[PDB]
Amino acid sequence: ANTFLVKEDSKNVTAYTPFATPITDSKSDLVSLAQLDSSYQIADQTIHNTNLFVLFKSRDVKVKYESSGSNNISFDSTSQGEKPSYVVEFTNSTNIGIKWTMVKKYQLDVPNVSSDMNQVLKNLILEQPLTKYTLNSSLAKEKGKTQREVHLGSGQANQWTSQRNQHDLNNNPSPNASTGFKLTTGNAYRKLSESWPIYEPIDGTKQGKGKDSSGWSSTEENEAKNDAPSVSGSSGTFNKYLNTKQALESIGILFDDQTPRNVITQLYYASTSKLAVTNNHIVVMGNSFLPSMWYWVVERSAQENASNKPTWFANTNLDWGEDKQKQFVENQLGYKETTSTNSHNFHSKSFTQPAYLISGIDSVNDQIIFSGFKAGSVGYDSSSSSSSTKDQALAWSTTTSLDSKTGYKDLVTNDTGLNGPINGSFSIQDTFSFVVPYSTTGPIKTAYPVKKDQKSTVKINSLINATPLNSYGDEGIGVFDALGLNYNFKSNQERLPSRTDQIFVYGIVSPNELRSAKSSADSTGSDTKVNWSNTQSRYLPVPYNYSEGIIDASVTTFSGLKSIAPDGFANSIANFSVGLKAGIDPNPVMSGKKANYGAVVLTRGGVVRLNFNPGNDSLLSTTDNNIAPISFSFTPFTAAESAVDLTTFKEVTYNQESGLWSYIFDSSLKPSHDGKQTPVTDNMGFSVITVSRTGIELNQDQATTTLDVAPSALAVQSGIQSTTQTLTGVLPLSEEFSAVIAKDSDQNKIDIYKNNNGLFEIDTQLSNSVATNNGGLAPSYTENRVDAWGKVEFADNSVLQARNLVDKTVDEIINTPEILNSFFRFTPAFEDQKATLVATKQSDTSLSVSPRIQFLDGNFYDLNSTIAGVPLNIGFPSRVFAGFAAL
Ligand SMILES: CC(=O)N[C@H]1[C@H]([C@H](O)[C@H](O)CO)O[C@@](OC[C@H]2O[C@@H](O[C@H]3[C@H](O)[C@@H](O)[C@H](O)O[C@@H]3CO)[C@H](O)[C@@H](O)[C@H]2O)(C(=O)O)C[C@@H]1O
Ligand SMILES: [K+]
């Protein structure tokens, strides 16, 4: 396909030429063609072996959770909300133009729910989604009980050293480590069958009801409503609560009037957001906005009218780099015991990390690459009656101690915080630190903050956060954990990682691995499990310089942390990621080695490079465990890339010739209204970020079979941007040129941006040259003008006599392209634009010539050129030369 597909709206894809002109009749309502109703919209699409694969989801979708029976998750048949999301394969049926016709249609059904699963789901509770307008102080939650309150009680740390052996806390120096955060105030937590609110607290430390469902709706909901009334063109004070309803609609939250639908519905609707296609499979994953708890492996062989089943992430073991890193995450999921009763969580029923904030998903060769953020999941005491941690989440910093032998392996396998709290505040000599200074009677013991006495009678259930933080507790370690600010005091000051907060996750998934997942999802009766063994994790905090005025040298915590966040988020503590995309390096590799491929993904403050070994389709590793897993590299943004609003991401393309990724941001995606219900007026324009590879890539020469330095990427705000125009599309014609299609008012306009030593600037003469197509598919040709086709002046016929070429025959001349380059002088419109003459015999004594000229995309066009089989009829001239001999 010599074309570019452009999504004109939620239903229509039009095919464009390299001349930024639509192919006539190509524009197609893919929803209508999928025989889907007018409630469906395109979520994502992809080309695989020249066919178009489309993910559609419905605004009418209604899902339910009934904790009893056991077909617990189902669609709501009553009314009209039985509207599952579909993937559809389209093929181009015509060889002239574009007639999309439907090939295969796959329904994405709701997860099976095992008995073991439904016992966790019964009491599963989920945080209200983070938005544009969520503040550091909105997230912040009331600090829970200390380790030594949980265990010994109201009473003393004079007995902390007499007692800590009788609660398996031997040598624990942290009686005032936090056991977590209160669910009586803050961001709303809700079961699968409940609805999140449109109101977010400004200070969640004071203003939320947390998981207090019943309390919200009889007390605090009327307060929120009177303080933060929806617009009605009202206006109020927004002293205690933002109103984010439109910001909510924006990120794909659905609504019956002013009330969001249940959590399970928003989970399903988000879950069907991104797609990727291999020879054998379609895989479907969720967006960067809500946590997703399941993904689809559809077998492309699937019979026509089947119901493809999603695999739970709680049933999907990843390799987090080392077993310890898994344990860290699983230990903090909840309390495990043979001794307790009805106390069910993901950990107690032997599930793993249940939820990811997925960056996106792609295919290279027959491989699925994904990445994303570990969505915080912890236990919470849902007990009723004198339970000390009642209504409290059970969470702790897991950040590596100061004394930890440096080198990555050691850092991420440090025993610090493994089974319970250890971190808070420490004044050694006079050198403050939040992190334990060492990790002597014997070695330091950590324990899960559920006191031995209540071990039988306690009720620890699972929750999921809206973000990559486990721990919302309004203490100083929380800020430092979230911002990447904990450092050792050694002769290098390597930064001390968490293994529960701000954890990024990526991998490459083989077709056998996707085969288990399909097996997990079809499993009769009990939960079948999947190992994905080509994965890694990484501590990836938000950058500290996206905040101000942090104290060191009244410690600053979440309720008081100041955000200066330039990337379109109020908050400066919760990381985000978007637009994972893979691509084959075009740069030759040494023969008998296979082509290189990577991927990249945007996170707050930087681009991440994932690196692969094409040999056995593995993550790049190196021998040393000192250097850190060489599958991952982080290149921080400058001012210019940091300024881009990441919540406006529209689409990411990769071009195999340039070896370059294009990230398109469209500001029309911004919500209509603020959290204070103020019309949003910077909703005009768009921006392009260009990512390239940097470093020494695998398999250049004998030296680059071995690598001990991870290849990386570089994101550059390219110069292609606007605060004025409405974007239709950006066509990356070549490294040297991009075409932008936009409306100033309401008609489409073509700008050409020219790369000038790395910075793209508009070329107004070339823009006018390209845009002057006169209704044709391609720019006009004018004899007397340097236009998009440069300028061609033919020699006079009198050159034959002068140069004694009359003694040459037509066949001689016609097979001597260097002679017939001497029949014209060419003036390029852009540097190194090229042109040749095609010759045609006309008589025994004469021929004609007609220029073949490169356009902006590096391709040659002539009289016979087509796009999508349609002759362009550009209008190149023909020129007779005559007086040559017959021999
Ligand atoms: C996470 C935690 O609990 N941190 C505390 C910390 C640790 O116990 C040690 O750092 C581990 O080696 O100690 C801090 O206190 C040092 C000073 O504390 C004084 O005791 C306080 C303390 O708060 C209580 O735990 C104690 O039982 O009684 C006192 C309360 O009135 C020492 O007696 C004093 O001489 C100091 O050495 C610390 O900052 O390092 C306090 C941390 O909360
Ligand atoms: K011309």
Curated annotation (Swiss-Prot):
Phenotype reported upon loss of the gene: Probably essential, it was not disrupted in a global transposon mutagenesis study.
Q: Which biological process, per GO, is one annotated for this protein?
A: cell adhesion
What Pfam families does this protein's entry cite? MGP3_C (PF19342), MgpC (PF05220)
Where is the region Disordered?
138-183, 200-234
UniProt biased composition (Polar residues): 155-183
Q: Where in the cell is it found?
A: Cell membrane
Where composition is biased (Basic and acidic residues), the residues are 140-151
Q: What is its main location?
A: membrane
Q: How does it sit in the membrane?
A: Single-pass membrane protein
Any one GO CC term of the record:
plasma membrane
Q: Under what name is this protein listed?
A: Mgp-operon protein 3
Superkingdom of origin organism: Bacteria
> Origin organism of this chain?
Mycoplasma genitalium (strain ATCC 33530 / DSM 19775 / NCTC 10195 / G37)
